[PDB]
């Protein structure tokens, strides 16, 4: 009984600042602190039902506000507190808990300091709807809501140019991903009368039309993938806590989160199994390649999410939903630290977003640099740095399958490729001689910074102790090949880091080497600004201007009534201006009229 | 100290004050609407006996304001 009551408390606590947003009571300067205090107690109230889940208990609740009664349907505000939904809530809340107190230090003394917190709460609420969604109509509220609140957050900085391009593209590529999602709605209603998520587990149909052109097409729009991903580096143009949330716990889960909930459909269909891994094979290396060449503090972390998303797509293709959410939950703790500890450098040395100009040494900054070493090594296959409890479990499970061999070989190169861009934060900018970005640059630790980073360290270290042990698993994967499958996950990180250190030091420590101008680089951006920022917006607007507007919508589609005006006025002139007076002429015409009635028309 | 960038503000802030003053003026029946469920009983599910079909309210369940 306590499970149902305490579940709604977490939902109500996040809406309480929105209830007090509309005047109500006056709060000067305390409004940014009010958001921090609201989520602080929201974490404690969410910890208890997860502790209940380890023991015993599973509950589904509806608010009885069913707005639909249309044709054999009921649609109440449904809240599911089961496994994938239950565990994700305190993980997502603890990630935000640090970001809100981080938002006290970053973006300080602004005229729109209060309005910045307003959209972030709605960015948290809409996600919590998507997590607990048990209706497919309820699922749309979250999946679009997170994608629509991102417009106000990515394009937060009021820029006359370039800043609004990112906010437009964030929904534009998302709405091409919507084509599948809305098709997934229409197929679900016609084939199944139930419409809600509680249907799929009983009388499951075997059809390829639903998950492929549907959930997988939704997984290409939301959450990076290969289909459309030019919105990832552009999103870095906004403030640093915004870019942190989009790529750690919130916007980055929305694509994968749907596929885990629809796990009985993926297991039965064999054609879906292949296409999820075949598209997942291209996501692993192609996006990881872009992290090497692109030299910006924020933009390296932007492409690193999509390379991590490749492994998140493999989990669906291997038919393991239990190990699917475990990677993302630990990924939430990986990049809540990594985004803003690197973001702390940008604010310290004036306003520099490039790794080349940045020279934040380990001796110069004591607190921020320690998080950068731990965070980068956590992404790679490390035995006890929370990497083995998330990344390595997928690699060991993938080898024992009837699935595609080319997709399996491509993932193995990407696991060793993680070591290159992780060291490209350390060796390229942090380590060695400082680049000196500006003469007399001040960098100091603030009281708000210490309370945020140190308490993030608990989440980044104890993630492989709490989440991995308490959650009940299904079917153990580790059994076969001690050197070919089991050792290969750990050896790739060791051989990758050795290859990264040898290649970087050869170019950096050389003095006289001369860089070659001629190179085979299809790596700088991946040639997506040449086709989707140059060709695709042009082709939709050329057909709009050379055709459509200048031919049809103003001339040819109009030419129905002006066609019966230009010919009507010609027929009008043949009666008015015709016969220039004279009684003679009118009486000559009357001679014919009698002859028409007698000869031409047969009547008497 | 600086003079800074200037907006209108006086016309802008007054409208929000003038809007909310008339929300609060009809915010009293909203407060009574809560007490109508509290003080007066809403509805109970019971089988109808053959005596009267409709009196005041014909068929209305939940909220006294519906009747």
């Amino acid at each position: 009984n306590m499970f149902s009551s305490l579940s709604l408390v977490t939902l109500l606590l996040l809406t309480m600042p929105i209830m007090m947003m509309s005047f109500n009571t006056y709060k000067p300067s305390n409004y940014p602190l009010y958001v921090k205090t609201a989520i602080s107690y929201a974490f404690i109230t969410s910890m208890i039902p997860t502790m209940m889940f380890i023991h015993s208990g599973q509950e589904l609740i509806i608010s009885n506000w069913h707005w639909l009664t249309i044709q054999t349907l009921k649609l109440s505000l449904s809240f599911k507190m089961d496994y994938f939904s239950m565990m994700f809530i305190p993980v997502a809340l603890f990630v935000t808990w640090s970001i809100m107190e981080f938002s006290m230090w970053y973006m300080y003394s602004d005229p729109n300091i209060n309005k910045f917190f307003k959209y972030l709460l709605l960015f948290l609420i809409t996600m919590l709807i998507l997590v607990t969604a048990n209706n497919l109509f309820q699922l749309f509220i979250g999946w679009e809501g997170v994608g629509i609140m991102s417009f106000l957050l990515i394009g937060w900085w009021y820029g006359r140019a370039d800043a609004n391009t990112a906010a437009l593209q964030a929904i534009l590529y998302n709405r091409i991903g919507d084509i599948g999602f809305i098709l997934a709605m229409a197929w679900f209603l016609t084939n199944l009368n139930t419409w809600d998520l509680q249907q799929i587990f009983m009388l499951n149909p075997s059809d390829s039309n639903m998950p492929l052109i549907g959930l997988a097409l939704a997984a290409t729009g939301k959450s990076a993938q290969f289909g459309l991903h030019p919105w990832l580096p552009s999103a870095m143009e906004g403030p640093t806590p915004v870019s942190a949330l989009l790529h750690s716990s919130t916007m980055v889960v929305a694509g994968i989160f749907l596929l885990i909930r629809f796990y009985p459909l993926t297991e039965n269909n064999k054609y879906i199994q292949s296409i999820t891994l075949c598209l997942g094979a291209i996501t692993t290396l192609f996006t990881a390649m872009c992290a090497l060449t692109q030299n910006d503090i924020k933009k390296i972390i932007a492409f690193s999410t999509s390379s991590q998303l490749g492994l998140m797509m493999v989990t669906i293709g291997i038919n393991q939903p239990y190990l699917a959410f475990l990677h993302i939950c630990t990924h939430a703790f990986f990049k809540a630290m990594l985004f803003m500890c690197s973001g702390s450098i940008i604010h310290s040395l004036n306003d520099e977003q490039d790794i080349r100009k940045m020279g934040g040494l380990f001796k110069a900054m004591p607190f921020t640099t320690t998080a950068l070493i731990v965070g980068s090594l956590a992404l790679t296959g490390m035995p006890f740095l929370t990497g083995f409890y998330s990344k390595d479990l997928i690699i060991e499970a993938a080898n024992t399958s009837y699935t595609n061999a080319w997709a399996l070989l491509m993932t193995l190169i990407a696991t060793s490729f993680t070591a290159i861009y992780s060291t490209r934060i350390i060796f390229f900018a942090l380590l060695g001689q400082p680049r000196f970005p500006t003469l007399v640059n001040i960098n100091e630790n603030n009281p708000l910074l210490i309370n945020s980073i140190k308490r993030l360290l608990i989440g980044s270290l104890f993630a492989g102790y709490i989440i991995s042990n308490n959650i009940p698993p299904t079917t153990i994967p580790q059994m076969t090949m001690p050197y070919y499958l089991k050792t290969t996950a750990l050896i790739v990180t060791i051989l990758g880091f050795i290859l990264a250190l040898e290649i970087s030091n050869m170019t950096k420590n050389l003095k006289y080497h001369y860089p070659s101008n001629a190179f085979k680089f299809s790596t700088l951006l991946g040639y997506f600004p040449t086709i989707m920022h140059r060709l695709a917006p042009y082709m939709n607007l050329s057909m709009s201007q050379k055709s459509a507007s200048s031919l049809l919508d103003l001339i040819w589609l109009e030419a129905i009534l002006p066609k019966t005006i230009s010919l009507a006025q010609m027929k009008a002139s043949t009666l008015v201006t015709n016969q220039k007076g004279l009684i003679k002429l009118y009486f000559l015409s009357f001679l014919i009229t009698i002859l028409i009635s007698m000869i031409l028309f047969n009547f008497h | 100290r600086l003079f800074i960038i200037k907006p209108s503000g006086f016309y802008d802030k007054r409208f929000l004050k003038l809007l909310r003053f008339y929300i609060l003026l009809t915010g009293i029946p909203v407060a009574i609407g809560i007490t109508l469920i509290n003080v007066x009983x809403x509805x109970x599910x019971x089988x109808x006996x053959x005596x009267x079909x409709x009196x005041x309210x014909x068929x209305x369940x939940x909220x006294x304001x519906x009747x």
Partner: protein, 97 residues
């Protein structure tokens, strides 16, 4: 030559000789209209009108059908085998062809 065509002039109330107003000319007309009866419709149609909309007077058998269906389910389950639908409004039709 225009002769009499030139007469156009820019006009705006803004704040000059108006203090703070919405209605053009006269402070007495402005306060009694633009803030009172303009916001009286905001209080009656929006706030007092929110009680209606669809909530309260049943609205086309939305709440009535639920009580009607439940008693028909329990009656047909105990006696009959077919649940609700089997042959809808058809009992002995005079042939077909």
């Amino acid at each position: 030559r225009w002769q009499e065509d030139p007469e156009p002039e820019d006009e705006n109330l803004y704040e000059k000789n108006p203090d703070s107003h919405g209605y053009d000319k006269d402070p007495a007309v402005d306060i009694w209209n633009m803030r009172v009866v303009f916001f009286f419709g905001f209080s009656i149609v929006l706030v007092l009108g929110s009680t209606f909309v669809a909530y309260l007077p049943d609205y086309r058998m939305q709440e009535w059908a639920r009580r009607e269906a439940e008693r028909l389910v329990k009656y047909r389950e105990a006696h009959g085998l077919p649940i609700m639908e089997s042959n809808c409004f058809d009992p002995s039709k005079i042939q077909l062809p």
